[PDB]
Amino acid sequence: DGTMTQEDISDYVAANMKDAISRTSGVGDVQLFGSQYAMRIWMNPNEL
Amino acid sequence: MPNFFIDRPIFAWVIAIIIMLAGGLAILKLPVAQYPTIAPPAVTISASYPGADAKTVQDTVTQVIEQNMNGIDNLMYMSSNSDSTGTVQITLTFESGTDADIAQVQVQNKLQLAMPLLPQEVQQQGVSVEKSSSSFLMVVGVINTDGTMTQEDISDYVAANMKDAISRTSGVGDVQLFGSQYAMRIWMNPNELNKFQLTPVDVITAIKAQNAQVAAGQLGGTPPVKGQQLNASIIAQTRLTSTEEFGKILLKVNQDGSRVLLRDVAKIELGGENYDIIAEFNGQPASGLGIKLATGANALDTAAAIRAELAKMEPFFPSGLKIVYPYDTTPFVKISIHEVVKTLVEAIILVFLVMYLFLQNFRATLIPTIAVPVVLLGTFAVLAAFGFSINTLTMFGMVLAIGLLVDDAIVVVENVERVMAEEGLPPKEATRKSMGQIQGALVGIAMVLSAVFVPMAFFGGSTGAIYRQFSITIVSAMALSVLVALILTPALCATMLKPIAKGDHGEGKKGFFGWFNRMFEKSTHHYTDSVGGILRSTGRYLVLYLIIVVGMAYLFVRLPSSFLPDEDQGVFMTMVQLPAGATQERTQKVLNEVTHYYLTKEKNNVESVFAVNGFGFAGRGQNTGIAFVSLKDWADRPGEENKVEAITMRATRAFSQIKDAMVFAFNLPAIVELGTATGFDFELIDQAGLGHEKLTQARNQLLAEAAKHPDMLTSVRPNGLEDTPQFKIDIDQEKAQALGVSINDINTTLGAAWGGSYVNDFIDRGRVKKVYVMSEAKYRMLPDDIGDWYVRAADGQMVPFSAFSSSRWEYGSPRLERYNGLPSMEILGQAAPGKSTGEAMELMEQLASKLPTGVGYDWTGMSYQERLSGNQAPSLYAISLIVVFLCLAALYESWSIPFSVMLVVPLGVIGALLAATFRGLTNDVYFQVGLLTTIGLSAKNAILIVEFAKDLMDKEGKGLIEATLDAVRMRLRPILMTSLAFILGVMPLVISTGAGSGAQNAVGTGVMGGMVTATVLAIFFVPVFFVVVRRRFSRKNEDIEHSH
Ligand SMILES: CCCCCCCCCCCCO[C@@H]1O[C@H](CO)[C@@H](O[C@H]2O[C@H](CO)[C@@H](O)[C@H](O)[C@H]2O)[C@H](O)[C@H]1O
Ligand SMILES: CCCCCCCCCCCCO[C@@H]1O[C@H](CO)[C@@H](O[C@H]2O[C@H](CO)[C@@H](O)[C@H](O)[C@H]2O)[C@H](O)[C@H]1O
Ligand SMILES: CCCCCCCCCCCCO[C@@H]1O[C@H](CO)[C@@H](O[C@H]2O[C@H](CO)[C@@H](O)[C@H](O)[C@H]2O)[C@H](O)[C@H]1O
Ligand SMILES: CCCCCCCCCCCCO[C@@H]1O[C@H](CO)[C@@H](O[C@H]2O[C@H](CO)[C@@H](O)[C@H](O)[C@H]2O)[C@H](O)[C@H]1O
Ligand SMILES: CCCCCCCCCC
Ligand SMILES: CCCCCCCC
Ligand SMILES: CCCCCCCC
Ligand SMILES: CCCCCC
Hints:
2 chains, 48 residues, binds dodecyl-beta-D-maltoside, binds decane, binds N-octane, binds hexane, enterobactin transmembrane transporter activity (chain B), cell inner membrane (chain B), transmembrane helix (chain B)
């Protein structure tokens, strides 16, 4: 529906689905194809 | 085999004797327990963040560990509490049958990935991973009878001299100290600190520097110079050992050379690492150890090892110190098992008496009597072979087995008798011909009987492990009984039986027997006379049979069903929960009331009370407590009113009138793991980052709605705590920067003063213990005290907290719950009277669907399994019926004749249902197994009756009615001998009072009623079943009378 970018989706999956799946019966390891969000501080060396 | 051993009695004896030795040896080594283990293993991770609030614990420790919990085998669910005591507990619950050692290894492998991400202060408190039951196995209390040690003294003694060895003992899963080990306490005074321009930061630095243990090398150490003569260790600073030494720690020297010592800015004393837990025993100062059993360990063995270790400590106690025993779950196990043993012995005695009444000869009665203990002992050997324990269920299996065993011996011994009476053949020759004619049937019967007891070995889940104990015990015993009947009994008949002369029936005797024997011979002709009559009638009796069936059906659907009875185990607990925000002093006042009640209003029932302030199943908190209560022996507590159920009910009622507290006494269930036979355990879940406040609102909405369906739901309530006022302090970054005060100094001053800080270790009387710095109590009681704490700025100026902070009141949680890694709130409740757990749960689900967006739910604990699903009964007894039919068809080489045996089934059930309905009993485990036994026996009786009739009609040429009557008359006596021996044998059970009498009563009364109706109803009905079935399913060829 055009409301979430790829990175949004990856955060949603990381933060709401992956942990439970990885604790599900018979599941051995789970690889995220993407990345959970972090707070990103993108520094500017000139302003620094 | 029979012929072989008839000529070799000594060989027969040798086999019996070796079987008994094997059994006796098993009994000496076999584990003893109340029940087989059915609890899901649970691994618990525990951590502590001194001075942290619940949210700080959750967001800094609990979430971090939880996110690392993955790829763990057999995990059913995970739950956690993070509380404002600074404590986290994370519980991982595993599938039944999971190896707890591996579960623990797998949990810790994941925990170690989280460990480095935890605050240093949390890592230094020690995180632990344990595998233990949730309940206490026992509490070992410690008091001082000379009153020469305070509560704090005793607690330190226990912590320092007793706790570690107990914690190392195999089978001990977890040990809780009810009190605290001493630490060196440095109680800081902000006024003095500010006066000397010092802060808690300087205090901590000085303690680390001056309470140090330094490695300093050696004189003449390797590699040395050539010619070296001296080698000695260099000893520099060592840990401080006393308050005197800590007091002279040098904080600084003034400009004028005067000294500032630690004792100048602090009070210094030995005192607890914490001050949250305070216990009393019968109102006096005490400490103690609350011990939990490691997963799967044997309760009795572990308790014995604990006592053995305690006994090693006693001789070195300081004067007056004494161990007391306020709460132990294990004595009841030992005692209840021993009462079942007594009934076994008693049962064998009664069997001996009934045998005599009929056999009238010491040596003869001895045969069926020897057979029982031989088979029973062998059965223990088989249990060992299969890795079973001696438990309540295997023991009742033995008791129930006696009916089957004694009947085997009786059938064998009686049949020989009848033979020596019907022919005057001598003993050796008679047992031969006898064994020749029944031996085939004994073996076949054991087969059809296994068809009634095996199916129950296949019940599913937790239920199943219980029924399996019986199944295997009873089947094994029956198999051994056939063996013994084929080896020992024939040998014994042939050597120990008295020659009976053709025609003799004991009427020649004078005295009671002569009289008895005459009455029976007579009453027998009267029996046959009656059947002969009934067989000319009938039609009417099929109609009576249908009455009994419908009646049976009526009683069945009306008899409520349960699982295992609650027993009075001579102990119980009382929970005390005040609102969060409540003080330790208020909790003590409520505990005093609880103690007072047991000490004064339950004098005749209660032996002791061990009450603990600051610990509950929470655990820790100022607003919680628990009392462990031990009752006097069952024998001094005669009557319903003096048993645990009525005591706990009266207590709860008295305690309901305690202001602003929830206090209730309750009896533990047979199996917690199973829970409250009616309860549900519900988890409300934040599925969408909603947050605590919104989850609370959803919870409240759900509670309100549930409060409107009293017709279905009762006592639907939260398991956790309500939000409480908290003091929010905002540090002003800009002001701090302006004044040159570091945020680290601010936070350490605030935290150390108001929360306390574990600095490093010291040595107290040879034992490593902790050093804590914290504000003296009077400077951390009031909000205004905050501004009395000063921090030193870079430019050396002392700056009060009030200069760089502001504060406000708000509300927050003292305890945050998570379930499967999501924020949660647990809700307890139960089905309203008349309503089924399923119904209540369905409704909880409906209401849950009406909740705000983002709120979900789950079922846990007792409600988890459970769906799962129920009622396997119909299916399994269905196949049981079918297999029984098939077995009988093989035995009789007929598809129709088996019905003449199977129609007896209802006749024992009816009496069982009647007697149980009458005594107010339930359709529970004990009712069911006893019924199978009763059914087994009446089946066996019917099988031997129609076997005899059929043979008569087949070998001889006897016609239908004649054969039925001769069959029924030959079988009356053996049937009566067995019925009476067994009904009397279970008398001790229905009559039982005392330890485990709930179980005993439940077993006994079902059997007694069943056997009574089975016996009286079968001896008339079976002949009916037979002729009615022989007609209906024949083929024009009689029913004379023919031959040959
Ligand atoms: C006709 C014979 C009847 C008894 C035959 C005995 C055969 C072998 C018994 C050994 C096993 C245990 O036997 C029995 O155990 C229990 C448990 O402590 C004791 O029975 C109990 O007596 C009172 C009341 O009944 C209890 O409150 C107490 O806890 C316990 O001592 C009995 O005193 C003991 O006889
Ligand atoms: C009619 C015959 C058939 C019925 C008999 C059934 C008896 C049932 C017994 C169940 C309870 C017995 O429990 C068990 O008893 C023995 C008796 O000392 C104990 O065994 C212990 O005592 C003896 C010494 O006296 C030692 O050989 C042994 O090393 C020690 O462990 C077990 O540790 C205990 O677990
Ligand atoms: C492979 C998996 C399943 C295993 C099969 C299940 C077995 C079920 C059998 C149960 C009943 C067996 O019972 C057995 O029946 C036969 C046949 O009547 C009997 O045999 C005896 O009685 C019959 C009839 O009176 C005689 O014809 C026969 O000569 C005699 O030996 C046995 O004395 C008895 O022990
Ligand atoms: C021909 C030879 C053999 C004939 C069979 C004769 C046996 C007759 C009695 C069997 C027991 C019947 O009783 C039945 O037991 C089951 C559980 O075991 C009960 O089941 C109920 O309680 C249990 C509690 O643990 C639940 O798990 C279950 O989901 C629920 O429906 C039934 O409420 C009851 O009706
Ligand atoms: C342990 C009991 C020993 C029994 C001896 C049997 C005596 C019978 C000899 C024929
Ligand atoms: C289990 C039903 C068996 C039916 C047998 C009928 C024989 C004529
Ligand atoms: C289980 C089916 C048995 C059916 C036997 C029928 C005999 C005619
Ligand atoms: C369930 C009845 C309890 C009494 C046992 C001592």
